[model samples]
Target: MQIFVKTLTGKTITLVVEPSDTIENVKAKIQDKEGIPPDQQRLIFAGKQLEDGRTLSDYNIQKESTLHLVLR
Candidate 1:
């Protein structure tokens, strides 16, 4: 499945990830793509943290879902 992501810097990125990918994995991918560190990564969906170990499905993420990230 593919997911849409937006960073705090107003950059938009898309990733083709597996359905089983956890929120942490997604954050890692974002960090890799944007050259940010995990310690500085803050992923939020609807103003809530996308905590580690939470699956996409567990968070009700669907194909082409969009997630917003704030790097601190």
Candidate 2:
């Protein structure tokens, strides 16, 4: 599925991922796309902060979901 990554810097990035992908994997993907290191990215969705070891499906993330990226 596809999801949106909206950053603190006000840019929205699009990513394609599987439900089984971990939050850490998402961070890695963001780093690959935007040159922002995973350690500096905090992801939130539906008002809940996401955990690195958790799967996207664990958060009930769906297609077109928006994951807010806050910088550390």
Candidate 3:
């Protein structure tokens, strides 16, 4: 599945991910591609903060969904 990761300033990137992918997995990928550290990222989806160990499927995330990225 694919999703959008958007920053506070409105910058966004499309990411390819699996339903089984952990929130940490997504953060790690962002670190690799966007040079942001996992520890510095807080991901929010459907208006709730995503937990590190949670899977995309756990949150019912589907294709084309968007995640808001905030820096801590």
Candidate 4:
């Protein structure tokens, strides 16, 4: 699965991930890759907010999906 992590700071990147990956996993990556704290990142996709417990498929995320990343 391919998704873009769009950061409000204008630092974004594309990620190839597993469909079974949890949003929490992505959050950790965002923290690791972009330096945003996992707890501080609020990820949203398809106009819906992603929860830590939810998997990518749970949100019906597909290839080339855009995952908005906002720091709070």
Candidate 5:
């Protein structure tokens, strides 16, 4: 599925990833696009930490879904 990820810098990155991809993988992609390290990256969806090891489907994420990324 293709999803949108908003970075801390206010940039929106679009990615075509599998629902099986781990949240950590999404975090890495966000880091790649926003220059934020994975260790310092925080992904929040609906105001909750996207617990590590969870896949997109686990959070009920679908195509065109948007997630907020913050850099710690």
Candidate 6:
């Protein structure tokens, strides 16, 4: 699946991921792509948090799903 991420900085990033990809793994990729450390990345989708241990499918994430990323 492809995910659409929006940063607080008004930047948008897209990344492809598998259903088994955990939020932590995605964060690590975002860290490399967006220059925000994984520990500092806060991902939100569907008005809920994207937990590190949870897979994308766990949250029902799909192709072109939009997530909010906040640096905190």
Instruction: Provide TM-scores for the models.
Output: 0.85, 0.94, 0.92, 0.89, 0.85, 0.92
Give the per-residue lDDT of model 6 (tens digit) for 11-40: 988999998999998998898897888888
Q: Scored by Cα lDDT, where does model 6 land?
A: 0.89
lDDT of 5 at 10: 77
Task: Give the range where candidate 1 is weakest over 10 consecutive residues by summed lDDT.
Answer: 39-48
- Tell me, by TM-score, which candidate is best: 2
Give RMSD (Å) of candidate 2 vs. truth: 1.1
Candidate 3 positional error at 31, Å:
0.5
How much lDDT does each candidate structure score? 0.82, 0.93, 0.90, 0.84, 0.83, 0.89
Error of 3 at 13 (Å): 1.3
Regarding lDDT, does 3 or 6 come out ahead?
3
**How far off is model 3, as Cα RMSD?**
1.2
Task: Give the range where candidate 2 is weakest over 10 consecutive residues by summed lDDT.
Answer: 63-72
**Which candidate should be chosen as best, given lDDT against the real structure?**
2
Error of 5 at 63 (Å): 0.4
TM-score of 2: 0.94
**Candidate rank order under lDDT:** 2, 3, 6, 4, 5, 1
Quote the lDDT for 34 in model 3. 85
**Residues 1-72, model 3: lDDT tens digits:** 899999767789789999999999999888887898788889989988899999999998999999999764
Q: What is the Cα-based lDDT of residue 64 in candidate 1?
A: 82
How well is each residue in 18-57 modelled by candidate 1, as lDDT tens digits? 8788988987888779887877777777667788888888
